[PDB]
Amino acid sequence: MRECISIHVGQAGVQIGNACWELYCLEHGIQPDGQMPSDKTIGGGDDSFNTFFSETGAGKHVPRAVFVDLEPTVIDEVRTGTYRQLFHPEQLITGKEDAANNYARGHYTIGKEIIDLVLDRIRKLADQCTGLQGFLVFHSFGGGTGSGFTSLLMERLSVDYGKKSKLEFSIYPAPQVSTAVVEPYNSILTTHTTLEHSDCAFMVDNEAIYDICRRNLDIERPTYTNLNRLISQIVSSITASLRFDGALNVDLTEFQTNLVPYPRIHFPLATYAPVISAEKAYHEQLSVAEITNACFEPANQMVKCDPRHGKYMACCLLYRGDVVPKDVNAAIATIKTKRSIQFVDWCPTGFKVGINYQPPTVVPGGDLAKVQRAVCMLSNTTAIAEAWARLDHKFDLMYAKRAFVHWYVGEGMEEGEFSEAREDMAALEKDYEEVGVDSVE
Amino acid sequence: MREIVHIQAGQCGNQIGAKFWEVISDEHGIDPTGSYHGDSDLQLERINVYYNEATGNKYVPRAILVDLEPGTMDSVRSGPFGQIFRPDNFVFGQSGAGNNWAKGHYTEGAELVDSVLDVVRKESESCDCLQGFQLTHSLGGGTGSGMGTLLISKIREEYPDRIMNTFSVMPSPKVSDTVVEPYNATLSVHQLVENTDETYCIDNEALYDICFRTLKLTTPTYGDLNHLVSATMSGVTTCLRFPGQLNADLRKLAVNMVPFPRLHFFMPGFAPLTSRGSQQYRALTVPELTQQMFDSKNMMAACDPRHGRYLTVAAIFRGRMSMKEVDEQMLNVQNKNSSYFVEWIPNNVKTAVCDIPPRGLKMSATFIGNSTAIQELFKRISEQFTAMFRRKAFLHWYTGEGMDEMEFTEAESNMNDLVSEYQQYQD
Amino acid sequence: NSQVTVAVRVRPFSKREKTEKASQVVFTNGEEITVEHPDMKQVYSFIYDVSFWSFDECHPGYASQTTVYETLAAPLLDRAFEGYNTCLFAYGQTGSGKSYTMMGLNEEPGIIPRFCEDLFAQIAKKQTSEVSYHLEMSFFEVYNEKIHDLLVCKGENGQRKQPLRAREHPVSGPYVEGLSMNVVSSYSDIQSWLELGNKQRATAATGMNDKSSRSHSVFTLVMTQTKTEVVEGEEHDHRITSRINLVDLAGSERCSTAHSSGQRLKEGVSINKSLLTLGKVISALSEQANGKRVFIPYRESTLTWLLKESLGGNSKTAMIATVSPAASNIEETLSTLRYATQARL
Ligand SMILES: CC(=O)O[C@H]1C(=O)[C@@]2(C)[C@H]([C@H](OC(=O)c3ccccc3)[C@]3(O)C[C@H](OC(=O)[C@H](O)[C@@H](NC(=O)c4ccccc4)c4ccccc4)C(C)=C1C3(C)C)[C@]1(OC(C)=O)CO[C@@H]1C[C@@H]2O
Ligand SMILES: Nc1nc2c(ncn2[C@@H]2O[C@H](COP(=O)(O)OP(=O)(O)OP(=O)(O)O)[C@@H](O)[C@H]2O)c(=O)[nH]1
Ligand SMILES: Nc1nc2c(ncn2[C@@H]2O[C@H](COP(=O)(O)OP(=O)(O)O)[C@@H](O)[C@H]2O)c(=O)[nH]1
Ligand SMILES: [Mg+2]
């Protein structure tokens, strides 16, 4: 009745999906063979909730998702791995060639040949759904598939569907760390195309999760299997009101109404405060006040953006477990009491609240602990302009000499587009400077 | 699938390939009969990246051997790992080159290049999505320089959308293993830079220094030198064959390591290398490997990077290791050694990781670097070259075979212009 | 010393557009050229060393076809009489009236005919029984980084388009092997040659118009000064040579919007590569005029490699860019301005 199609573009999106569909399939009791051991015993119920998972008559539960990577190295781990009998074999393993970390390849060259199949699978599911609301598009700035292809997909989903939600979780580029040299070019050419079409685009930084893991969880040598699980917990808290039942249900249409004031500033941040290990899971009460004070605490945020260098515009707070609203009220009072946390002079409310009764589940072989309650904060700030400027300086430093451009023209990017796109990001860096101003009566 | 065609030309390329295949077969589990006797199953998933199939569950490689005298081809055949090569691909002729770049580019090379292309077309048309080509060739010599460059020129017209790599063995500073190193190497460079994507510039003095200092060997034969180049060649094409956390391939590195097209001359490097005794007193971690790689006593280019600013750097690691260690140690390298890096490129490094390492190591690493030091390899040649050409020393062996003095000054000016191009980003 | 003398020319509305009511988006204020959207949000403003505002006949600063010649070219011809090589460029998508600006009409000449006629007129005024002036020419093109000559005919077969190759002379400079060169004494001779060259040129439709241009085209004039001067034996003919060039470049062609596929994609790629390299060349030349020390990458494209000795050195370069003032064509008009702007700085 309330479905959401999950699109996973690239290696990042696919590994994150392997984490998400592990967590979800653990919650509802699904085994990787696609079956329920409970429904055969109790003889009823829909704990395998139909927001994410479909159902046929033989007693299986197939997910509502499709994978696409433009390379066969990743999806051939799923096909040949543990979750091979769950997914529909229509995963796009169009493994001719990668996008070469070139936005041009994944937007016109190898962006064709693959898209008119992707759209013919998103449409078989939407015709299989009755009350669809959303398109959760996991992708990654920097990569060619994750940037060109995701932008191309957004262009296709805004012409055929229209009045729907289209969201984005994305690995924003770390300021110091990087696995590529032309990350900024692809990022800037992405935000010029994923602006008018997307509704709310979340953002994270692997440097921030690295600093979280070695300071909260006591892990000195982490890896992506220890990060994508936290991202999966974010996505589960974001997408829990559609699965389980709680007092205050917050759907996906409620985010873009409360966190996106103007249509161009839809770039919030995310955080999740209890990241403590079993040893640290004790020695601590885990009350709503501690969590709600941790979610605003720097060094627990998931982007290297000191929010004390800027102001906030809105903050959604999605809670889970044994929470009483009185404590949330007290905590929000305590937060609005302080002065280090500046709010704008046109959003005194600045808060949305959402509660669910289900606790979060513990993935075996994982790093987190068992909690009676958990929290996720979406937060829009005027601080993130710092990173757009830090990303524009790099673009300018390289485009003055015009390096790494013959690879983009070689696949059909003229010359104006680098210049034209960078003039569209100055407007966004200027809007954030406008909203930070206090009005005059 | 992505697929490579491996051409190899001359006394260097044959002897290198005869060990590189003997290395890839160990990795993927093939024996001298062409049959599979492995233990795992990831060895067959991407065996089509190099090999082709046969009837009795055998595998035959995509090798194209193009010498101009059979004295070396008859050594691969009568060797350990020669009976697997397709006998219709032992291409050769007679009337050898005589270390004359003209004899292997105009007169006695054009009479055989069409026979090589008749094999290249067969071995390309039978491939779903070709990624590019390889080549192993020695500058200074004959066939490997001339016929190699001619094959590059004649491939770049038919398959320009694809990649062409050449693991060039460049000449060395101190000792000349051939008297006509400059006059051949200059004209090989003049034909490479216009018609290549990424060439790896190997030198032999560096490999001597490596095998003597690090590996602590007293009798380094060339079977031990090529044994390194093979590791590098494997490390480059690893994520194209095995899986990992963050994949990579040839074209991604070509985007990240070639800012402008002419500047695609790289220094390679492999880690970890140690003596058969001194392996008991070293730790296997990412920072140790990084220390060994960014040191100058491992780079095979015979040129010190400390004389130059790095323009762009790549790293390909193989093993179950952490990503934070890589993303931290590389940032540390850029921070402490900033003067050895450029400023108008903010991040001069990239990474790639595979989760299937080499047969005997818990983890490995591989290094590629574009540097402004490599000008010294050509600044020397243009010094060696013109001192000969100022008074036409050996030139009569080249005008005799259909050339002219203009074709020398062309390359002499091109190389100098490239030296200027690199020197622009030195101060 | 090296200069670039960027300029822009805005055409007036055509009868087609005055009937169809095409809007106006580009405006002027002296040296400012502003571009205002129909209703979008904002405006960009561009500065150039020279500007030509041919929108309205009654505005001040109306740049007619005569003032275009008396402000850009004539310095090149009064500099070529000194002994220096010159290069004039041209850039603009189809419809902006490049042809109206360079060649022109029978009653509204462009730059080419006024240039050649002022030349031939200065010859006879500047000619004696000892001094002379011999003029040979050429007309060639670039197609996917392959040189081609246009004066010679092609046979009725699949193709007679022989790809001549470029070479480097050690003293004079780069050149082409097999370039036909013909002689001129009256502009009718050059007209009879271009009326064949532009017929033999590459041109095709992609998605917007049936008559376009998909190949750079160079028109070179070699000029000589065989003067006899010595009072010992009436010999020692001290001769000076000059190379004038008037190239007509092509469109930049965002490919996606056209969905290019096949023998159009390659062409767009190669054209845009040549544009990118020429941009670096002009920018670094203007930066070299200010006393810096930098590298001009002529070798990354055939066109620059065949003009190493005409742009650099003690030579003069010039560029005029054409753009339409309509609102229908505004993504292809902003590009031109940004291109020529970076060519200026
Ligand atoms: C007890 C033990 O650890 O044996 C090691 C060993 O002693 C060392 C020194 C090996 C040894 O290699 C050498 O000593 C060597 C060095 C230069 C030239 C020729 C030989 C080794 O022979 C080489 C071999 O290298 C490998 O890891 C792969 O087996 C190697 N395969 C081949 O090269 C090969 C060649 C012919 C036939 C079959 C396989 C390889 C390396 C990279 C990529 C692909 C394959 C290994 C682990 C060892 C020995 C065997 C002692 C080292 O090898 C490499 C390539 O890293 C040399 O330094 C490393 C460190 C290892 O500790
Ligand atoms: N959080 C997280 N980020 C990842 C993961 N894998 C890759 N990334 C990010 O992805 C970025 C690079 O883009 P790619 O991973 O190559 O995305 P892609 O779609 O495969 O792009 P191409 O390789 O060009 O096809 C890196 O900077 C990583 O930070 C992952 O498993 N988890
Ligand atoms: N590394 C290595 N280099 C070699 C080998 N054999 C020859 N060379 C080098 O190749 C050069 C000689 O060229 P050569 O191969 O004989 O010319 P060709 O036969 O026409 O290709 C010299 O610089 C040698 O150092 C070898 O087995 N290993
Ligand atoms: Mg990828």
TrEMBL record, chain B:
Q: Which residues bind GDP 1?
A: 11-12, 99, 138, 141-144, 175, 181, 204, 222, 226
Name this protein carries in UniProt: Tubulin beta chain
* Pfam families listed in its UniProt record: Tubulin, Tubulin_C
Query: What does the similarity note say?
Result: Belongs to the tubulin family.
Locate the residues binding GDP 2.
Answer: 11-12, 138, 141-144, 175, 177, 181, 204, 222, 226
| Quaternary structure and partners | Dimer of alpha and beta chains. A typical microtubule is a hollow water-filled tube with an outer diameter of 25 nm and an inner diameter of 15 nM. Alpha-beta heterodimers associate head-to-tail to form protofilaments running lengthwise along the microtubule wall with the beta-tubulin subunit facing the microtubule plus end conferring a structural polarity. Microtubules usually have 13 protofilaments but different protofilament numbers can be found in some organisms and specialized cells.
Highest taxon in the source lineage: Eukaryota
Q: GO cellular-component terms in the record?
A: microtubule
Which segments constitute the Tubulin/FtsZ 2-layer sandwich domain?
246-383
Q: What is the lineage of its organism?
A: Eukaryota, Metazoa, Chordata, Craniata, Vertebrata
Main location class:
cytoplasm
